[PDB]
Design a protein around this nucleic acid. Structure first.
Ligand SMILES: [K+]
Ligand SMILES: [K+]
Ligand SMILES: [K+]
Ligand SMILES: [K+]
Ligand SMILES: [K+]
Ligand SMILES: [K+]
Ligand SMILES: [K+]
Ligand SMILES: [K+]
Ligand SMILES: [K+]
Ligand SMILES: [Mg+2]
Ligand SMILES: [Mg+2]
Ligand SMILES: [Mg+2]
Ligand SMILES: [Mg+2]
Ligand SMILES: [Mg+2]
Ligand SMILES: [Mg+2]
Ligand SMILES: [Mg+2]
Ligand SMILES: [Mg+2]
Ligand SMILES: [Mg+2]
Ligand SMILES: [Mg+2]
Ligand SMILES: [Mg+2]
Ligand SMILES: [Mg+2]
Ligand SMILES: [Mg+2]
Ligand SMILES: [Mg+2]
Lengths: 206, 99, 100, 117, 129, 84, 153
RNA sequence: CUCAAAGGAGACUGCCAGUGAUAAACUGGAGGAAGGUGGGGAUGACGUCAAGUCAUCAUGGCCCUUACGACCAGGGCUACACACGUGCUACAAUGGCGCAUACAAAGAGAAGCGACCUCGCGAGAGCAAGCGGACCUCAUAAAGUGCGUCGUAGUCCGGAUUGGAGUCUGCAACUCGACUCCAUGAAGUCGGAAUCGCUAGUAAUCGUGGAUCAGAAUGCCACGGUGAAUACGUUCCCGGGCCUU
């Protein structure tokens, strides 16, 4: 059957929120819309920067955006030129003074969003889906995840009949609430249509 | 006397803010009554989870707004100015009243 | 929703904002108990002259990311589907799965 | 026990007995009794003629029985021969106040009429 | 038997504060007499039951304030609070009170309404076709 | 219905049309799409072609039509019975 | 049920007399959870019965229950072939439950003015071995007697 | 002290007895607020039905491009010989009506909730506090209880339908809104074959709130009050699990 979202079910237990601000009903929707626009622009702009997570905070009449990246040098540029440009655009979009922080994602092979994006890029480059998933699982297991599962669904290899294929190593205990499960998805737009990728990575119980 | 009203979606964050407020208020001479835990507000939402039909398949969500009250009675001059510059953490709403 | 359907809503919001007060004072004149019997008639006739799209009752709440005119939620400004997606991704502060 | 050309029950309270007149409900009956100065819980059997005659003119103050029936028939006939939407609804026997006709509407349509072949 | 003894009683959404002291048998609930407050004979019996069990009905004076719930819930909460007050007064009555079953707090509450059901458990009428 | 304190409603364009028609001898039908306008005691005698959705049907305004809306005399749905 | 895990639920005794028997009777008579209304009806009927007879309310009620209580009923038993109506002994608790239910149903079926009056008339008829619920006990006993030959299944 | 909300304690077959293969475990007892998964929720394995959704969105391919795109007014989605599903209100006296009088929980509010006072039979209107709220408003809980009446009648049951007169929202209540007043007062007197839900604070019954929303719930989601009956048992009906043939 259908499964609960692994991040959503853990949002108050072992996982943190991606947006941390307080608002009343008067500006809640406006803040949500501005966050959506900011994340949209940042994701579109930093497509090749290996961005895994965009955290947004609103301390007081200002916006602070933390970008978790595996290529901080590419994100920042020479003496902060690119990050300054992004700060300007984010301030323009949000209508408030903006402050951009860069967080380091060491070991990108252990980050669910980055793994899914890598598999998706390979699929769009017409790499064998089996090879892509096996490589991702092997890399994560070698780096030391307690478990990983990768699932790819759609017209794999351009087949007329779509199907779902998944691989798993170690343990991925989705029913354990206190389990550190990093889960994320991605989509590849191939000439035969859309292929969906889901990645679960287990990092031990807290 | 002045009233400090603290709103937060996270009770740990609100507890940290109240602890630092009462510390920085008691250090500067003025005494503090509280902190007082006001009743938590629980806003609830129910949504249909299927894109089409299946009326009985729903997700129920809630937002918990925690509320704290801080009394500062007999505020000194060095007490008053030692409050707005504290710059509490994000996600905490602070309302100041001159009661 | 369609692009034209979204443009209709933005135009309606703009017209309502533009003609806000010019409607309010006419309605006050019409609803005035101690008003005369001919200035009331003139105000009633003038209220119809304004474009229909300037009335706030012509606006339909739509999802701010898709344009969906059904299943809207005011607290978030989104339809139920998008609210669920954002909540699961963790993008709605303080919102989690409830149980009591 | 004879008001407005009809006979009212004698074993009932005055307020209940007065409603038997077409055009008199509970509220109008209460108003008439208050105007006449008669209690509501007294049976009209134990009422002297000097109270029935004071009820009669109070009843005559209103439009009841044949006059009311003629007025209602006249208004409905006016709708029908005007031929407005309400008049057409009255002509066809369908509900006139915008109720659903896909189902229900049995009060206006009578009992069900099965289709013939 | 020289100072006030206190008990807390709870039943459904009712909470009752009971103050007990030596006396002659006068009971006040929310600044009213027992018969003035509880018009139900069942509620009166529920209130009186611990005193009848312990044979100390006319040796004590009862001062009780209650809020929440309804008549039966308030009576049960009062009974629980009276039992606790008597236990605070004398600790040898715990065995007999537990044997009578008054020490137990009745935890039965209203079951929540659930999605897809008309009530806590009543389902909508089913039809095969 | 419409509150008494607001007075009966009438569309301004139709009011102008009937004002221009009553003073003249114009007996041509007054074509209109305004079924929401109340019939006023100033256009008894001339014919108004009210829209019903797909055409304009002419109603001859009489005294007894005062107080009704123009659409009350222009039915919108065509019905002739089932299997009749 | 299959698992045999059902205990017993204690019932508070009735206010006026402290009889769980009468409390169960009130529970059976009660509709829509209106226990105070049921208690008032039962008390009025019991006082009418007590003033009609020479015994107390409890004694008259016990006489009526003794006259209405069945001893053997018939239950269906399906074996290889056809189903038989086997006579089975009724346990005392079910005897009381059936007697009360039959009395309440007969009183509801009666056509007097008030429910308390109907219940009093039904109780008096039961004490004199007349009327419904007594005819019902008789019918049950007759069926058991007619099917006595099957009292080994 | 009730309570508000943070941090802790508590329940673990922990102890006792018996049974059991020196086991797992079961039966009962003590203590305790709670006893054996304490109650309820969340949580849905590998998969199945080419199950649903190209009309939330996204997307391969196909198709239209002075039109299958775009704007507007009016109408329709509310039709009506009929058939089915899901509900509401009843058929009454365990009740209707009148007067008096108690006892809840949960929640919402700024183009918002709107008190007091006055006017109106009423829906409401005028004026105008307080409240971004444990403070103010929505907001009187109802069933209940006491007294009186109705006295088994298609009724003082029932309130459908229709005539007349109004209120409010809204440019605008004809098609096609909700509510109020006066009058009108239909079927219906417990429902064929058949069929549904429920094992305890459940069913039944009684009110209250919220989302949507200018206005427009008998639907949906949620909250308390009162508060049952019965379960001997697994032969039979339905679905399912394990071994075997
Ligand atoms: K139907
Ligand atoms: K497509
Ligand atoms: K329309
Ligand atoms: K209709
Ligand atoms: K319904
Ligand atoms: K039905
Ligand atoms: K009647
Ligand atoms: K309408
Ligand atoms: K088999
Ligand atoms: Mg589109
Ligand atoms: Mg609208
Ligand atoms: Mg009459
Ligand atoms: Mg309930
Ligand atoms: Mg179905
Ligand atoms: Mg589990
Ligand atoms: Mg299919
Ligand atoms: Mg289909
Ligand atoms: Mg249009
Ligand atoms: Mg439809
Ligand atoms: Mg009636
Ligand atoms: Mg069960
Ligand atoms: Mg609304
Ligand atoms: Mg098994």
């Amino acid at each position: 059957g259908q499964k609960v979202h692994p991040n959503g079910i853990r949002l108050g237990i072992v996982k943190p929120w991606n947006s941390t601000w307080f608002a009343n009903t008067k500006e809640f929707a406006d803040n949500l819309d501005s966050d959506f626009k900011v994340r949209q622009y940042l994701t579109k702009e930093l497509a090749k920067a290996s961005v895994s997570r965009i955290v947004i905070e609103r301390p007081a009449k200002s916006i602070r955006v933390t970008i978790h990246t595996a290529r901080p040098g590419i994100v920042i540029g020479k003496k902060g030129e690119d990050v300054e440009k992004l700060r300007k655009v984010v301030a323009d979009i949000a209508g408030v003074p903006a402050q951009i922080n860069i967080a380091e994602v060491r070991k990108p092979e252990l980050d669910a969003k980055l793994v899914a994006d890598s598999i998706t890029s390979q699929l769009e480059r017409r790499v064998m889906f089996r090879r892509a998933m096996k490589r991702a699982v092997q890399n994560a297991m070698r780096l030391g995840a307690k478990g990983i599962k990768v699932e790819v669904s759609g017209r794999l290899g351009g087949a007329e009949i779509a199907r779902t294929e998944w691989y798993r190593e170690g343990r991925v205990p989705l029913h354990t609430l206190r389990a550190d499960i990093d889960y994320n998805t991605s989509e590849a737009h191939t000439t035969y249509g859309v292929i969906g990728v889901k990645v679960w990575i287990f990092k031990g119980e807290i | 006397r002045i009233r400090i009203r603290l709103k937060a979606f996270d009770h740990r964050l609100i507890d940290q803010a109240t602890a630092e407020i009462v510390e920085t208020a008691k250090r500067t001479g003025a005494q503090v009554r509280g902190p007082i835990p006001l009743p938590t507000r629980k806003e609830r939402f129910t949504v249909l989870i299927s894109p089409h039909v299946n009326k009985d398949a729903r997700d129920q969500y809630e937002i918990r707004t925690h509320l704290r009250l801080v009394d500062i009675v007999e505020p000194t001059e060095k007490t008053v100015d030692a409050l707005m510059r504290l710059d509490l953490a994000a996600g905490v709403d602070v309302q100041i009243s001159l009661g | 929703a369609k692009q034209s359907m979204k443009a209709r809503e933005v135009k309606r919001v703009a017209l309502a904002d533009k003609y806000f007060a010019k409607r309010a004072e006419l309605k006050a004149i019409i609803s005035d108990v101690n008003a005369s019997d001919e200035d009331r008639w003139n105000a009633v006739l003038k209220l119809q002259t304004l474009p229909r799209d300037s009335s706030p009752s012509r606006q339909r709440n739509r999802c701010r990311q898709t344009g969906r005119p059904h299943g809207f939620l005011r607290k978030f400004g989104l339809s139920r589907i998008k609210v669920r997606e954002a909540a699961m991704r963790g993008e709605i502060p303080g919102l989690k799965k409830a149980s009591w | 026990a004879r008001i407005a050309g009809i006979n009212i029950p004698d074993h009932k309270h005055a307020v209940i007995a007065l409603t038997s007149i077409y055009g008199v409900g509970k509220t109008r009956s209460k108003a008439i009794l208050a105007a006449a100065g008669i209690a509501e819980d007294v049976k009209i059997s134990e009422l002297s003629e000097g109270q029935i005659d004071t009820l009669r003119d109070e009843v005559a103050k209103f439009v009841v029985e044949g006059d009311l029936r003629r007025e209602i028939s006249m208004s409905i006939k006016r709708l029908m021969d005007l031929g407005c939407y309400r008049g057409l609804r009255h002509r066809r026997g369908l509900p006139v106040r915008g109720q659903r006709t896909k189902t229900n509407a049995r009060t206006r349509k009578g009992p069900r009429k099965p289709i013939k072949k | 038997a020289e100072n006030q003894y206190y008990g807390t009683g709870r039943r459904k959404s009712s909470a009752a504060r009971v103050f007990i002291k030596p006396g002659n048998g006068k009971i006040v609930i929310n600044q009213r007499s027992l018969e003035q407050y509880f018009g139900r004979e069942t509620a009166r019996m529920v209130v009186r039951q611990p005193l009848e069990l312990v044979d100390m009905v006319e040796k004590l004076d009862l001062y009780i304030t209650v809020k929440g719930g309804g008549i039966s819930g308030q009576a049960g909460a009062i009974r629980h609070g009276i039992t606790r007050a008597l236990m605070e007064y004398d600790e040898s009555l715990r065995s007999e009170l537990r044997k009578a079953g008054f020490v137990t707090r009745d935890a039965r509450q209203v079951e929540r309404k659930k999605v897809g059901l008309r009530k806590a458990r009543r389902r909508p009428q089913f039809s095969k076709r | 219905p419409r509150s008494l304190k607001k007075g009966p409603f009438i569309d301004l364009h139709l009011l102008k049309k009937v004002e221009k028609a009553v003073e003249s001898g114009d007996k041509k039908p007054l074509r209109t799409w305004s079924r929401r306008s109340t019939i006023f005691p100033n256009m008894i005698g001339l014919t108004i072609a009210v829209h019903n959705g797909r055409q304009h049907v002419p109603v001859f305004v009489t005294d007894e039509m005062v107080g009704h809306k123009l659409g009350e005399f222009a039915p919108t749905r065509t019905y002739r019975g089932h299997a009749a | 049920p299959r698992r045999r895990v059902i205990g017993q639920r204690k019932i508070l005794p009735d206010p006026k007399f402290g009889s769980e028997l009468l409390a169960k009777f009130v529970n059976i008579l009660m509709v829509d959870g209106k226990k105070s209304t049921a208690e008032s009806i039962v008390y009025s009927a019991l006082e009418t019965l007590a003033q009609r007879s020479g015994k107390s309310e409890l004694e008259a009620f016990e006489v009526a229950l003794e006259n209405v209580r069945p001893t053997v009923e018939v239950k269906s038993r399906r074996v290889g072939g056809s189903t038989y109506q086997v006579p089975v002994e009724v346990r005392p608790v079910r005897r009381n439950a059936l007697a009360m239910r039959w009395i309440v149903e007969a009183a509801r079926k009666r056509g007097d003015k008030s429910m308390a009056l109907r219940l009093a008339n039904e109780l008096s008829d039961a004490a004199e071995n007349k009327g419904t619920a007594v005819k019902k006990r008789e019918d049950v006993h007759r069926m058991a007697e007619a099917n006595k030959a099957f009292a080994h299944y």
